[PDB]
C-alpha cells in the first residue's frame, strides 16, 4: 500500500539496466525522477508523523501495548522498504555515471570538451557534483605511482604493430613524437598503432 509507489521507481531502474545491458555503444541516462522521489519523501514524512502520533497516544496510556506494536512495526517496515527502493535506484544511476567517467580518459567531462554522449540536464545537481569529484579522483590517481602506465588507456590487447587508418573529421597539422601528421579529410594513413590510439579514441580516425 504505502510502498506500492516505490515499486514503480524500481521498475524504471530495470528498464535503464536493459539500456545499459543492450548497449553496443555508450548511451545516455534518461530523465531524473524527482517527482516520484518527492512523492516517496512525502509519504515517508507522513509515516514519521504517524509514528510520532502513535508515540504520544501510547504515552498517555489509552491503548494497549500489543496493539501499538503492530502499527509501529508496519510503519517501520514501510519506511525501510522505501529506503531500499531509493537506494537501489541511486546506486544503479551512480554505477552508470562511474562507468562513463572512466570511459572518457579521465578529464573533467561536461566542463571541458565531451564526446556528446550525455546531455547536461538529465543528471541531478548532486549527481553533477558527484561526477566532478569522481573525475578529480581519477585525475589524481593517474598522477600517482603509476605514471608510466596510462590507467585510462585502451583495454583491448595489442596484436597488430602496423595498421591502416582513415580520417573522419578535418583538422590541422599535429606534432607527434619525432614527426608530424597532416589530417586532411578523406585521406588514408599507414602508421604504427601506438601513435593513433589517442586520435581514434577521440573520433578523428577510423578503422584499426
Partner 1 sequence: FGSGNVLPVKIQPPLLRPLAYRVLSRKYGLSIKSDGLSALAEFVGTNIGANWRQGPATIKFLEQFAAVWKQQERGLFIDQSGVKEVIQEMKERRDYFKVINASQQQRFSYNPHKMQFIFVPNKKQNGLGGIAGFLPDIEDKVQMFLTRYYLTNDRVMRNENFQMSITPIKNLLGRDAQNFLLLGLLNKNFKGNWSLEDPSGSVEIDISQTIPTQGHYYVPGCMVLVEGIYYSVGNKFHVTSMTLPPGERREITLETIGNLDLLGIHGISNNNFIARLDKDLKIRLHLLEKELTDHKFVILGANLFLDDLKIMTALSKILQKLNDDPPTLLIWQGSFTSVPVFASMSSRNISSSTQFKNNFDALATLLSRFDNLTENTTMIFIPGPNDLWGSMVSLGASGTLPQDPIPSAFTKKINKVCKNVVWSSNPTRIAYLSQEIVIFRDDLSGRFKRHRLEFPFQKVQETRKLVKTILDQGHLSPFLDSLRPISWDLDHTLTLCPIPSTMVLCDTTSAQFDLTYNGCKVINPGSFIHNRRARYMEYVPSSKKTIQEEI
Binding site for partner 1 (CB under 8 A): 31, 34, 110-113, 120-121, 125, 142, 147, 150, 171-178, 180, 198
* 20/93 Cα distance (integer angstroms): 10
How far is residue 135's CA from residue 152's CA, in Å, rounded to a whole number? 12
Nearer to partner 1, 23 or 194 (CB): 194
What's the min distance (Å) between Cβ of 9 and partner 1? 18
Query: Among residues 5 and 68, whose Cβ is nearest to partner 1?
Result: 5
Nearest distance in Å: CB 168, partner 1: 15
Within 10 A of 43 (CB to CB), how many other CB atoms are there?
A: 18
| Smallest gap from residue 101 Cβ to partner 1 (A) | 16
- Of 30 and 67, nearer to partner 1 (C-beta) is 30
**Which residue shows C-alpha cell 525522477?**
33
What does the block give as the cell for 38?
518527492
Give the span between the Cα atoms of 119 and 125, in whole angstroms. Answer: 13
Task: Please say whether the dihedral angle defined by the alpha carbons of residues 98, 101, 107 and 111, taken in this order, is positive or negative.
Answer: negative
Q: How crowded is residue 124: how many other Cβ atoms within 10 Å of its Cβ? A: 15
* Residue labelled with grid coordinates 497516544: 57
| 173 strand-pairing partners | 182
Q: Are the C-beta atoms of residues 131 and 101 closer than 8 Å to each other? A: yes
Nearest distance in Å: CB 115, partner 1? 12
Place of cell 508496519: 74
80 or 136: whose CB is closer to partner 1? Answer: 136
- Residue 165 contacts residue 206 (beta carbons within 8 Å): yes
Complex with partner 1: residue 35 or 64, whichever CB lies closer: 35
Q: How far is the CB of 121 from partner 1 (least distance, A)?
A: 6
Amino acid at each position: 500500500m504505502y510502498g506500492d509507489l516505490g515499486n514503480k521507481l524500481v521498475l524504471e531502474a530495470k528498464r535503464t539496466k536493459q539500456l545499459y545491458a543492450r548497449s553496443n555503444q555508450d548511451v545516455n541516462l534518461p530523465m531524473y525522477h524527482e517527482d516520484i522521489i518527492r512523492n516517496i519523501l512525502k509519504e515517508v514524512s507522513n509515516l514519521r508523523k504517524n509514528t510520532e502520533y502513535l508515540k504520544e497516544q501510547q504515552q498517555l496510556g489509552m491503548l494497549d501495548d500489543k496493539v501499538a506494536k503492530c502499527q509501529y512495526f508496519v510503519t517501520l517496515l514501510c519506511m525501510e522498504r522505501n529506503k531500499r527502493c531509493l537506494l537501489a535506484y541511486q546506486r544503479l544511476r551512480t554505477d552508470i555515471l562511474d562507468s562513463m567517467a572512466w570511459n572518457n580518459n579521465g578529464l573533467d567531462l561536461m566542463s571541458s570538451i565531451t564526446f556528446s554522449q550525455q546531455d547536461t540536464n538529465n543528471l541531478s545537481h548532486q549527481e553533477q557534483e558527484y561526477l566532478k569529484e569522481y573525475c578529480d579522483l581519477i585525475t589524481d590517481l593517474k598522477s600517482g605511482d603509476l605514471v608510466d602506465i596510462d590507467l585510462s588507456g585502451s583495454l583491448v590487447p595489442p596484436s597488430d604493430v602496423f595498421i591502416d587508418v582513415r580520417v573522419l573529421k578535418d583538422a590541422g597539422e599535429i606534432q607527434t613524437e619525432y614527426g608530424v601528421f597532416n589530417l586532411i579529410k578523406d585521406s588514408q594513413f599507414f602508421v604504427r598503432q601506438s601513435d593513433v590510439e589517442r586520435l581514434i579514441q577521440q573520433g578523428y580516425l577510423q578503422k584499426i
